[PDB]
Design an enzyme around this catalytic site. Structure first.
Site, PDB file in Angstrom:
ATOM      1  N   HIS A 110       4.373   1.074   4.520  1.00  0.00           N
ATOM      2  CA  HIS A 110       3.395   0.910   3.943  1.00  0.00           C
ATOM      3  C   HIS A 110       1.808   1.378   4.547  1.00  0.00           C
ATOM      4  O   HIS A 110       0.530   1.423   4.560  1.00  0.00           O
ATOM      5  CB  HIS A 110       2.757  -0.780   3.656  1.00  0.00           C
ATOM      6  N   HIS A 136       0.859  -1.435   0.264  1.00  0.00           N
ATOM      7  CA  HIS A 136      -0.055  -0.128   0.114  1.00  0.00           C
ATOM      8  C   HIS A 136       0.916   1.164  -0.180  1.00  0.00           C
ATOM      9  O   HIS A 136       0.086   2.379  -0.128  1.00  0.00           O
ATOM     10  CB  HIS A 136      -1.067  -0.319   1.398  1.00  0.00           C
ATOM     11  N   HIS A 140      -6.891  -0.525   8.192  1.00  0.00           N
ATOM     12  CA  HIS A 140      -6.197  -0.149   8.587  1.00  0.00           C
ATOM     13  C   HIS A 140      -6.118   1.118   8.116  1.00  0.00           C
ATOM     14  O   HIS A 140      -6.897   1.657   6.728  1.00  0.00           O
ATOM     15  CB  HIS A 140      -4.579  -0.540   8.166  1.00  0.00           C
ATOM     16  N   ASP A 148      -7.967  -2.256  -0.242  1.00  0.00           N
ATOM     17  CA  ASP A 148      -6.731  -2.959   0.322  1.00  0.00           C
ATOM     18  C   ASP A 148      -7.483  -3.692   0.748  1.00  0.00           C
ATOM     19  O   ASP A 148      -8.226  -4.112   0.911  1.00  0.00           O
ATOM     20  CB  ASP A 148      -6.114  -2.520   1.657  1.00  0.00           C
ATOM     21  N   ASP A 186     -10.037  -0.357   4.419  1.00  0.00           N
ATOM     22  CA  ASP A 186      -8.626  -1.299   4.841  1.00  0.00           C
ATOM     23  C   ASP A 186      -9.206  -1.400   6.299  1.00  0.00           C
ATOM     24  O   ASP A 186     -10.376  -0.753   7.205  1.00  0.00           O
ATOM     25  CB  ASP A 186      -7.878  -0.010   4.259  1.00  0.00           C
ATOM     26  N   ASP A 232      -7.059  -6.436   2.370  1.00  0.00           N
ATOM     27  CA  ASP A 232      -6.826  -6.832   4.092  1.00  0.00           C
ATOM     28  C   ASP A 232      -7.954  -6.006   4.840  1.00  0.00           C
ATOM     29  O   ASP A 232      -8.349  -5.937   5.454  1.00  0.00           O
ATOM     30  CB  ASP A 232      -5.115  -6.847   4.674  1.00  0.00           C
ATOM     31  N   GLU A 261      -1.804  -5.236  -2.103  1.00  0.00           N
ATOM     32  CA  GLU A 261      -1.801  -5.672  -0.974  1.00  0.00           C
ATOM     33  C   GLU A 261      -1.396  -7.832  -0.413  1.00  0.00           C
ATOM     34  O   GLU A 261      -1.684  -8.281  -0.179  1.00  0.00           O
ATOM     35  CB  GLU A 261      -2.407  -5.760   0.693  1.00  0.00           C
ATOM     36  N   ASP A 280      -3.514   3.457   7.913  1.00  0.00           N
ATOM     37  CA  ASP A 280      -1.766   3.550   6.860  1.00  0.00           C
ATOM     38  C   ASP A 280      -1.920   5.474   7.055  1.00  0.00           C
ATOM     39  O   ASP A 280      -1.430   6.034   5.958  1.00  0.00           O
ATOM     40  CB  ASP A 280      -2.769   3.533   5.314  1.00  0.00           C
TER      41      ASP A 280
END
Ligand SMILES: NCCC[C@H](N)C(=O)O
Ligand SMILES: NCCC[C@H](N)C(=O)O
Ligand SMILES: NCCC[C@H](N)C(=O)O
Ligand SMILES: NCCC[C@H](N)C(=O)O
Ligand SMILES: NCCC[C@H](N)C(=O)O
Ligand SMILES: NCCC[C@H](N)C(=O)O
Ligand SMILES: [Co+2]
Ligand SMILES: [Co+2]
Ligand SMILES: [Co+2]
Ligand SMILES: [Co+2]
Ligand SMILES: [Co+2]
Ligand SMILES: [Co+2]
Lengths: 314, 314, 314
Positions: A136, A96, A121, A227, A119, A229, A272, A123
């Site tokens: 990332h 990412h 996250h 992303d 995401d 994830d 990712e 980030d």
């Protein structure tokens, strides 16, 4: 929809190396063919050649800054090129951190863009709030205008210029946010829908609010940084930083189907996907297949079905 | 939040013995450390020493009445002690029969408490409506004032005094209720949200209604008795009476995140975790990890993130 | 509720043969016993003897037309018989092509019926729009009055007479619709809730709208054709045409619990259960068990519990 595919085989934004294989496994799954199978005008710009930067010692705690900085600088140029060609940039990524270049290059042609970040996250760690040192988990901090002055001069990023305001981004799917990151969210007033909000309102209302939030004042190009994830690891296990209790396969497709329907999708990141992290050959295909489905939904594939403008009954 | 941890290694409320290992596996997973990792003031009162009652023949169909009765009498005393210490009692349990002592002891210090019972079962069978004879499916019948006169004099429970009214409890997650139990629900007018209601309204509305139902008239301490079988066995498989179609990991965390936000959590039970019933080492860790996550959410851990009252950007 | 069970061990509507074993595995799982365990009046009409039609060459692209046509003609007669007996027909099926006979026979006794089709597919391809040639993906086209004139004279179906209008059917769970099929949906104005609509509104609103849509003007008998592939393959894996991102176990039970509560269930189809396609003995039992649960919900089994009209406390 007209697409400009850009493979970004990069992994230096985090520790595990198999992420640079993302472009390869996605192409292998037949992403181009499948996109073309739809009313899609597909042009592959190939995989960017990210040369090695042998000399790249950490900047304080931050790892591979020159390598990450260069990969995004190179990607920013490619994305701006495809945007200048009147096509939706589709970045098949590695980690990412590449969002820095993708959003930067996109903003050069369309400065009024709005960002939707799917995401687990945020980030948004800065080089000074990060504890992992993995870039990332810091892409958003380099892009935010409000954070300029809080980002030190990191080797490899002198070319960067914050291009988005805290008000031009919406997060969806958050479930593992660092303390400093959370402080930034609340301090800058960033709009987000963590898994708690999705549970509370349902993905339908979440999307209604997201699009109204970003397109209310006026229609503007949309950049979707997805992303993998962000989705639950039961769907996308082959990823470096998985977090349980994620968005479902259905919610993932709902998010994208709705974005597609806006007719404003301008940039897309599918990031990712790391085949090397699948505990089994099946977890790898499960991750890649879900990543493909999400991509196709961004470009028109609807679950209720699709049909050409002809008389099928004749 | 300030916590008083009480290990209750007890299993005689049902047939399978591994449930008494619940306190051990939860502590091992680092529950204390993790709680402290939050702004939590944690005091461990240790595991109660539930001595053996060799002579404990059934009361009619009811099994191990003296052993179950004694364990709850002992637990009631401990819980009232921690409550008197100004701390939220956290009972790491064995079987759900322990709810009799936990709620009883809690009510001694806070008679105005409201109860939220997260479970796939109502556990409200009386000694006369039960068909299994397992006391972990009868705790609520001993606590309800409206049912006093319908509970025979069972050896070991002469110390019990119904402390809650039918109107002071809400069930969430029901999906395996016995006929007599259902009759009691409808007859006493007990508020519940079975899996059908959760599907209909969504966990968000379910929680809005639950808290409004219990806190509308006035704010009062909240007792959360969380049976891990309330969640789907895909998340908590190592439990004695699992039932498919349960609450999801997300809904579980949503329930607790919302209860935490009330600032009224007063008592908590994390029950029925039985490591010995995991088909694999992974099902055991999956159950324990989910049990820990739920616990942490009860004490402040939010999915959107948390941050201390400092300037993280400095 | 009073039921008339009809086993339809048929598979020629598609390629895989194990689907004809559906009646057997469902009975084995104790469906009769379990139904009777409820306030159900159960009469088993047995398994229809679908004799072999050795000479059955394709009609253009359409496969086994005479065999499929005959099986439905025979089933239509049985269903009309059970309906004439004042019982809810419960067709334990093989492939979904049998819906032609089940709905046809049902409509002979109750021409005003409304149909709820739970499926990942619309099964509305005509003999001319189908690409697979499998008749289990064309049942609805033969039943729709609006499509009469678009269905060629296929060997074995001369007995068929379109019995339902485009406005008398609602689809729930769609996620793999062919182009011609989608064209038909939009052209005839058929009401549907694909997985996208379920994600958007939630199964609760979906059912509210479905029943209001079909029962608004007036109450009428309801025919529920439940294809087990409508549910996610994580629940019903042993099926011939599985599609990821399906309805959950909970949504499946919610759908049926709501239909039951109408008191208007008149006909039911439990189709496409194919034991031979389970990757493991457990996937087979998982599919059969879920199929049974759905069936029981259609006849009164509620997740909040059930109780007879007696005083359980006495
Ligand atoms: N690596 C320095 C620690 C910074 C910390 N992650 C914070 O921002 O709270
Ligand atoms: N890309 C995931 C980021 C994970 C963590 N917040 C970090 O900063 O390393
Ligand atoms: N064990 C006596 C049977 C009572 C029965 N479970 C009922 O309450 O309906
Ligand atoms: N704790 C689960 C209770 C299960 C059943 N209702 C019983 O009474 O044994
Ligand atoms: N088998 C002839 C092709 C028809 C095609 N499935 C369509 O209806 O678009
Ligand atoms: N019964 C599933 C039908 C699948 C596909 N639409 C077909 O027509 O063969
Ligand atoms: Co992430
Ligand atoms: Co990310
Ligand atoms: Co339970
Ligand atoms: Co319980
Ligand atoms: Co189907
Ligand atoms: Co079907």
């Amino acid at each position: 929809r007209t697409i400009g595919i850009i493979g970004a085989p990069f992994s230096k934004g985090q520790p595990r190396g198999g992420v640079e294989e993302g472009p390869t496994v996605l192409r292998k799954a037949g992403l181009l063919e499948k996109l073309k199978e739809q009313e899609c005008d597909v042009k592959d710009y190939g995989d960017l050649p990210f040369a090695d930067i042998p000399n790249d010692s950490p900047f304080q705690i931050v790892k591979n800054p020159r390598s990450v900085g260069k990969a995004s600088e190179q990607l920013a140029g490619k994305v701006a090129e495809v945007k200048k060609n009147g096509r939706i940039s589709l970045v098949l990524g590695g980690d990412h951190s590449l969002a820095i270049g993708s959003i930067s290059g996109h903003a050069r042609v369309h400065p009024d863009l709005g960002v939707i970040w799917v995401d687990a996250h945020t980030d948004i760690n800065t080089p000074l709030t990060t504890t992992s040192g993995n870039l990332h988990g810091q892409p958003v901090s380099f892009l935010l205008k409000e954070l300029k002055g809080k980002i030190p001069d990191v080797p490899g990023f002198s070319w960067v210029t914050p291009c988005i305001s805290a008000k031009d981004i919406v997060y969806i799917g958050l479930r593992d946010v660092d303390p400093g990151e959370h402080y930034i969210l609340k301090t800058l007033g960033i709009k987000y829908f963590s898994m708690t909000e999705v549970d509370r309102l349902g993905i339908g209302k979440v999307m209604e609010e997201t699009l109204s939030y970003l397109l209310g004042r006026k229609k503007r190009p949309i950049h979707l940084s997805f992303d993998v994830d962000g989705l639950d690891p039961s769907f996308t296990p082959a990823t470096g930083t998985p977090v349980v209790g994620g968005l479902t396969y259905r919610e993932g497709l709902y998010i994208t189907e709705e974005i597609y329907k806006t007719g404003l999708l301008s940039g897309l990141d599918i990031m990712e996907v790391n085949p090397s992290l699948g505990k089994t050959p099946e977890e790898v295909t499960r991750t890649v297949n879900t990543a493909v489905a999400i991509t196709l939904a961004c470009f028109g594939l609807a679950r209720e079905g699709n049909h050409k403008p002809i008389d099928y009954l004749n």
